[PDB]
């Protein structure tokens, strides 16, 4: 056989290739090492993410690489489109997808920066995944809540609160009008607050607020832990206590243990809130990493009932146009490509249940008009500081946020332009709600750059 190094382009670049509906497609934005042309850079990504390596091997002749190789089939500027045959991937495993698509190709000398912008998951591969264990429709039916965004909020301080104090804040928030509350992503089990203590007291608070308000309540109990076994143990205790919800940091815990908990959540009847902690480590910069829209697709495939999508207007970064596309990717049955929103491919969702977007981080009452305009009804708006930072505390703060959302929803439904009239609508509602007025006055000057 013909030993020696060959160009990646020879086998792994094929501009005549026509993608199949069963192919997995990737849009990579490539920054080649100086002097490396886009075609060889793209071919290297395709080869080293599928079947090839740096020199020709005699064992290539034992198989048919034409059937299994990935192929770059199109290049537009610094964006390369690569097609991967369906047979390359393990059914039902996001872990396997990442092991191929983002396994080694981000660290090659020949490609100095690489960003996975989008991915077309073929229906035939989607069907190997179960999707969310509950889904928006079934979740709204379990909550008996229709016609408005749902209210939530992270308990603060992030860390340092004892179990009983933690449940007091929960109680105040929920009895004041929030639908849910949640553990901070980094609140697991620690010397100042052990998880069994927190789970017990918090669920007393949840049941009490539910009896007193007549509305169904929940707290997103964080099961995130150091091992899958421990996470499953914490999920079992949540169910034993009758919690409607648990919560997992799906990126820090990891997709394999995420998959384990999602299975257990469906078996136990638990709804699954998913926090995207760590995502900004690699989805922020435009030259390198993985765009959040790709993460969002993987999240819906494994099965999360909600996932954070950003706020655009809050303290953490987020683009409005890209966020509109991500919300569609999470909630719709079919999402056509749209260059204006960074959607490189049409995405059929093959009947997988939809996921709640969750907008959280540095938002207060003045943002509600923007938030309702961006996400519509099928979303959670979380107010942590925006609830407990109310001049009169968490109960008054919860009422202010619930009133604000309902007033803006009402105005929108009557035909008013809630962006043009946003302040006016809040002022109208504030005349009948002193808690809302005080929140408006406290944070009126607190703005973040968009």
């Amino acid at each position: 056989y013909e030993a020696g190094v060959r160009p990646y382009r020879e086998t792994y670049y094929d501009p005549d290739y026509e993608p199949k509906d069963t192919d997995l497609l990737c849009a990579f934005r490539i920054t080649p090492k100086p002097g490396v042309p886009m075609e060889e850079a793209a071919a290297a990504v395709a080869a080293e993410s599928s079947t090839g390596t740096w020199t020709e091997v005699w064992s290539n002749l034992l198989t048919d690489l034409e059937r299994y190789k990935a192929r770059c089939y199109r290049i537009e500027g610094d964006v390369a489109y690569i097609a991967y045959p369906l047979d390359l991937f393990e059914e039902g495993s996001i872990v396997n997808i990442m092991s191929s698509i983002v396994g080694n190709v981000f660290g090659f000398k020949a490609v100095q920066a690489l960003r996975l912008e989008d991915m077309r998951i073929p229906v035939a591969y989607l069907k190997t995944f179960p999707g969310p264990p509950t889904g928006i429709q079934v979740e709204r039916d379990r909550l008996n809540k229709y016609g408005r965004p749902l209210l939530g909020g992270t308990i603060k301080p992030k860390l340092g609160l004892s179990a009983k104090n933690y449940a007091r804040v929960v109680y105040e928030c929920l009895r004041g009008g929030l639908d849910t509350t949640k553990d901070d992503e980094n609140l697991n089990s620690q010397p100042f607050n052990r998880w069994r203590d927190r789970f017990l007291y918090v669920m007393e608070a949840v049941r009490k607020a539910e009896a007193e308000t007549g509305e169904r309540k929940g707290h997103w109990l964080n099961v995130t832990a150091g091992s899958t076994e421990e996470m499953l143990k914490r999920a079992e205790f949540a169910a034993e206590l009758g919690s409607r919800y648990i919560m997992v940091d799906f990126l820090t815990a990891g997709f394999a243990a995420f998959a384990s908990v999602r299975r257990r959540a469906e078996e136990l009847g638990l709804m699954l809130h998913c926090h995207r902690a760590m995502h900004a480590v690699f989805d922020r910069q435009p030259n390198h990493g993985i765009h959040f829209r790709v993460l969002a697709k993987w999240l819906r495939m494994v099965g999360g009932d909600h996932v954070h999508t950003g706020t655009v207007v809050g303290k953490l970064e987020g683009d409005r146009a890209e966020t509109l596309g991500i919300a569609d990717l999470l909630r719709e049955d079919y999402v056509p490509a749209d260059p204006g929103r960074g959607l490189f491919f049409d995405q059929d969702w093959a009947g997988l249940k939809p996921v709640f977007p969750v907008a959280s981080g540095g938002i207060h009452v003045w943002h509600v008009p923007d938030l309702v305009s961006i996400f519509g009804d099928d979303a959670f708006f979380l107010f942590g500081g925006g609830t407990h930072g109310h001049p009169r505390g968490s109960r008054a703060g919860a009422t202010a946020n619930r009133v604000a959302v309902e007033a803006v929803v009402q105005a929108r439904n009557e035909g008013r332009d809630i962006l043009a009239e946003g302040r006016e609508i809040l002022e109208e509602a504030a005349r009948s709600c002193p808690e809302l007025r005080e929140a408006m006055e406290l944070w009126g000057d607190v703005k973040f750059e968009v």
Binding site: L161, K164, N165, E172, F192, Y201, K208, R392
Partner: protein, 99 residues
């Protein structure tokens, strides 16, 4: 029905209550007021009267808040609480008013 600490002594007078509030403040703890119409072993979360008085300086400011809570909720049990954020837990809790 007993109400935990001091409920086995005669009901406390205004002066005696104030002396307990002075004990809380002397030791650098935070006084607070809670009330409910549903006392009993099942209720771990009595209603807050405002927030814990982190800014309180005198026992008299606390007694004034106790009277305003009583006026608004004369049908409720009302207890004084002292709180320590170092140990992070209540260091004293007793009923000051009974309906």
């Amino acid at each position: 029905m007993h109400t935990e600490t001091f409920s086995y002594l005669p009901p406390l007078t205004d002066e005696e209550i104030k002396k307990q509030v002075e004990y809380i403040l002397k030791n650098g703890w935070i006084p607070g007021i809670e009330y409910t119409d549903e006392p009993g072993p099942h209720n771990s979360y009595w209603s807050f009267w405002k927030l814990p008085f982190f800014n309180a300086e005198t026992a008299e400011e606390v007694m004034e808040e106790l009277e305003a809570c009583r006026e608004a909720n004369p049908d409720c049990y009302i207890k004084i609480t002292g709180y320590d954020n170092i140990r992070q837990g209540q260091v004293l809790s007793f009923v000051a008013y009974r309906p």
